[PDB]
From Swiss-Prot:
Whole-protein coverage range: 60 to 844 of 1287
Domain of life: Bacteria
Keyword terms: Cell outer membrane, Membrane, Periplasm, Secreted, Signal, Toxin, Transmembrane, Transmembrane beta strand, Virulence
GO CC terms in record: cell outer membrane; cell surface; extracellular region; periplasmic space
Name recorded for this polypeptide: Vacuolating cytotoxin autotransporter
Entry keyword annotation includes Nucleotide-binding: no
Protein task: Induces vacuolation of eukaryotic cells. Causes ulceration and gastric lesions.
Molecular-function GO terms, alphabetical: toxin activity
Domain remarks in the Swiss-Prot or TrEMBL record: The signal peptide, cleaved at the inner membrane, guides the autotransporter protein to the periplasmic space. Then, insertion of the C-terminal translocator domain in the outer membrane forms a hydrophilic pore for the translocation of the passenger domain to the bacterial cell surface, with subsequent cleavage.
Membrane found in the keyword field: yes
Amino acid sequence: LLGWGLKQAEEANKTPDKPDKVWRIQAGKGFNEFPNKEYDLYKSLLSSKIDGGWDWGNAATHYWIKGGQWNKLEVDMKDAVGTYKLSGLRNFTGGDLDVNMQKATLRLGQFNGNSFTSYKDSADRTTRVDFNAKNILIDNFLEINNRVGSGAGRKASSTVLTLQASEGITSSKNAEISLYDGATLNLASNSVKLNGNVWMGRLQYVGAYLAPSYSTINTSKVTGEVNFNHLTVGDHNAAQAGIIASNKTHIGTLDLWQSAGLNIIAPPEGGYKQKTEVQPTQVIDGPFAGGKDTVVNIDRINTKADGTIKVGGFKASLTTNAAHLNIGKGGVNLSNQASGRTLLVENLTGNITVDGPLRVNNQVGGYALAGSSANFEFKAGVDTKNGTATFNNDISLGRFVNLKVDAHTANFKGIDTGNGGFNTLDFSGVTNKVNINKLITASTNVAVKNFNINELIVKTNGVSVGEYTHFSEDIGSQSRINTVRLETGTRSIFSGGVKFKSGEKLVIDEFYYSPWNYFDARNIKNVEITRKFASSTPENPWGTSKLMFNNLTLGQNAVMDYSQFSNLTIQGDFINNQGTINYLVRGGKVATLNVGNAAAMMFNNDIDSATGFYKPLIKINSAQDLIKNTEHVLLKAKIIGYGNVSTGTNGISNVNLEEQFKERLALYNNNNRMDTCVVRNTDDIKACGMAIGNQSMVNNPDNYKYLIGKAWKNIGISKTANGSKISVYYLGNSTPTENGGNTTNLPTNT
């Protein structure tokens, strides 16, 4: 109920105790001349002033110092050379050891482990066990503040164990350090490398599943290389461990519980440092900011999860203060029971750099049912609000899993949610940018206020309906997608789809149609295209594609593929800039373009060297089966405001705008134009006669000499350019005369 930050702050500043009978033992002659002897330490030295016994209640064994557990023992070697071992000091209640062994190697295990416990008297004492060796070499298990026997009798209060080598504190493979509800562990060597199962937080009593169970491993003094190997927080309770680290903390496999915490606290930037009765000042610290060169290199975060079912999840979490919370190649695992387990990888004043696959139940997909919402969560830079959450791995979300990221700039590489569905991909906490590289969605609840997704795959959901991609908040202005690529849906029904909710503009560069997947573009006023606007099946479109817009704009050079098989619905001001929309007929019919409100158009002298004419502003291709003597609805309209960037074409003039609309349109056939035939030499005359179907231009190039730098329009092809309708009247493929009319010059604006 207090939390770890208060409990550690009230154990960090305590006067040790008030012991009567401070026993003192000094190792004299004999010890300091055999540098390899492998002594024992209890039986050869310490057994003089440490007497065992049997406790009635929780009855296994019992150890204290001498005449009760309130007597300090201090041992002063300072020159004893050798290698000492404890090997079996179990259930030491005791109180205030002190073993000063410079130039001596310790060993806290040989065929048996150790324990350091206290009792809960009315005085609330700690045990402050110290060692001051040169190497320590744990080499078997060590419990700190364990249970003595079984529950009854006297309970266990807090303790402190301090290990203070000057060359290194290694450990075995099977040396399980396991500290409980009240225990701490101060380390002060250089290059701690605990190669065993460090177990912070454990069931102290046999059934107390509602214990707070704090702990601490204060490795602040370690001037070398802190290196855990297998850390394991929590066991069948809500443990809140904490590590006060030393700005470089490589660990290995981390195993949280369902409802377990972790507080890896890096140091700050400059490093550390009757009658009334005035209690001493209790300095207490809130969550500060770690220094610049503070790293926490975790390389695997599993989560053990079994037990009951609660109305919420349990939200395992780890909270860091470091400036870089790297996570290595093992990534993130998350076991999931019936209710939805949750992981909170927080970082208060830093960054997050995950380089691993977000697994669930140790597979990359990780299916989960409806009640089991496995919720990943990240918080990069909460208190400073300028922390990025870089992911350098292609993530993959299965079914009913919910990634959320609350950072300043959430970079990515690729998201795969097309597999399972029901994926709340929240980004509402993100300050500005979400620079995703590739996105795959089936039924997603994307909530981004500003993004840059330079590739978008939208997949359908088979045959089910009501499930779709949903950008369910305000997209704003600065958004951008450099490629959209819908894929083909199912037969005769719009199963999957895209819809928006708000925003004003989003620069799409490239787009693809698809049969039976709908690109709803609600409430956004400047849906812009800038290059190729095609379909997924350019050789055989079929079905429909509900491009249910409200407005769009089309920029330079953006070729479209407008067909009868995609009901491109506009309710807004379609602005076409210097960009060439292409048509196809699919059986002699011309697909009209149903403008709801207005289609203004504005261009330039878009001349190229491919024809010598302007670039074809509207292309009508495959018009061989185009039915002669029939009205072809090219586009529905309400206001066609045609224009250019100047008033008159070819420089400046006062020619009306709608007449050169008939010039720059095209009717493209047989790799040429049947609309006009703009001529600069004699070689194009052959293909010109092949296009218009006359041998008077095929066999004889000098049949017509009105075409040296000139052009001619095919009469019998009529086009309307008034302000409410634009249509095509293909009524004649006539042979032009030489010097009678229907002749124009070159534009010549290169």
